Amino acid sequence: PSVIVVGGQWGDEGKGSIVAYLSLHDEPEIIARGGVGTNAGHSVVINGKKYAVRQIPTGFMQTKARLLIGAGVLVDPEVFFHELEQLKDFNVKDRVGIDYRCAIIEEKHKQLDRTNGYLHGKIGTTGSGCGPANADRVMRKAKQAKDVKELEPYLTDVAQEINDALDEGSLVLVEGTQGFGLSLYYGTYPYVTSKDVTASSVAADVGIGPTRVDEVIVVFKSFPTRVGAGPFPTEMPMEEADRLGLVEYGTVTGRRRRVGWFDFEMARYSARINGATMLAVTMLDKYDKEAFGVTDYDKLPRKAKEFIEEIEERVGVPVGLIKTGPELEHIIDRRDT
């Protein structure tokens, strides 16, 4: 089958941790990244050890899953190589593949992203250079992965590989970056990322026609977060975030998250435009601590269950995945309901 994982809020909803579980649990042949580039920080906890990737998909754990990066994604050579080293224990380097049509993040781009009054001060961007690079790509002057000789051993056709796999019945897992709220089209412009992030865009990033997409999982966290500036309707004061212990720092910039309550009307909208078939809710332990570690649905505390059900009815999409903690095992899998 086909599964696409996207964010339903402003990113950082726990997409990495979910692609993580699905990789190990469902054993996909191919696990691919779509999204923008390296502006994303996806974290996963593996038996007490927290990892964080930006370029390589969050599934390296699967020593038997081909790891791919779609043509629509930006590639930062420095970051890609650092993560080859950072994940050597998983033999990532032998299982990885960069589409030869990917655009390249150069140091001129990182610079611009890090210095300019508008992207750095006002928006304010990540500094990954993803913004200015796509601008160069739109202007068709940026270079492609084909033109970087240090990347030649890893060059491939991700679009072909993925489609070739789908023909033989193999399972393909696709990872998107950010969340619906950061969509260049449907997000809170101009406080967004440099590209649409919805499931349709992610499919185009890896090279999959919309008809070939079987499942679309949209990830939500119990308390939505925003890094950087921009409107946040259900935003809470920072004093409350502490009290409820909702303090988190960026995985790339290291800046505080801005925390808020679950926006249901936004959730319904985000889920529907994505064409969500299944919802996934994370950090339920942060909504109610008594739900920590729980792996069966009906052993959830009651205050936790009325949250999942309130979501399921005000969004109109079943929740088939509930994460109850940082660890892999901290997950409820209601794929049979």
Next chain:
Amino acid sequence: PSVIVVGGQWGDEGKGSIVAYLSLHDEPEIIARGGVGTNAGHSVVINGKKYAVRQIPTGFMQTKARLLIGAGVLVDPEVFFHELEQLKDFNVKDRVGIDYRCAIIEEKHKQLDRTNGYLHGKIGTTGSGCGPANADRVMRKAKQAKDVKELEPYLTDVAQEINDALDEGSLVLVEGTQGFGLSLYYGTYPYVTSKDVTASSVAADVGIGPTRVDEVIVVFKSFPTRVGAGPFPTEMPMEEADRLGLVEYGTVTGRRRRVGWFDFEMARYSARINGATMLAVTMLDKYDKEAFGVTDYDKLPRKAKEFIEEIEERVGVPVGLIKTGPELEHIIDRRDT
């Protein structure tokens, strides 16, 4: 259901003429149009009168239908108002709706697109300003349709309208621009347009999840064409294009189209990444003159049928629409197979 129409070559495959037929024939409630923007020239012949639109979707013909422009599309106010005027007898002004999140083409964009040595001289672009506009949008500096007061009476939520329609069971027809060969990701970079053009991107442009897309029509012409520079594998000398009477001029720029022989390998690739369910072939009358006007498959000349069948086997997708001339009636509809 849902049908998305996209190009399989380098644009100008007759997408307009096909969205045309489908609008009148199948009577869709909505007829959104994706693509990049106004850089597209879509022509249709209505009972001897040839029309050409850039902003308003082909399908204005259908007076019962709602005409929409997805948020992912660029909007040129001048062109939009000119085409409201160019098409009054169809009363487009009342049935049209622009997504309030569309980015705006300003004259600063147009000038740079027409003058700059790289975009104008090497590529060379259309001059619609779609390139620089998207660059300004990626940089999140562009204006949105909400911010243009002259556009307020036509502002709407295309994503909502389309999805609301798909819930009532209504038919939604979606029009894309260009062709696969001009895709920013998978086309002939840098000789491409400023955005991915495949069906998944087109779906994201209007606000439709990949799971909500029922049918994907990829349009091919008997002899592929290229406007502007860039690689063209099966390109013929211009002497042969006149010899075969294959001379066509740009709908927008009036530039003469480079002509070539049917590229079968590029068609299978283009069709497959698009996730094509159905093929549509136009200008069969240009491949064999004896096929002109034929509206039934049974009566096509032999040389005509071995072309359609050679396509069907070397591309691996059934051809359910065969256009045999400029007029609406000049069509073979094998959608029942």
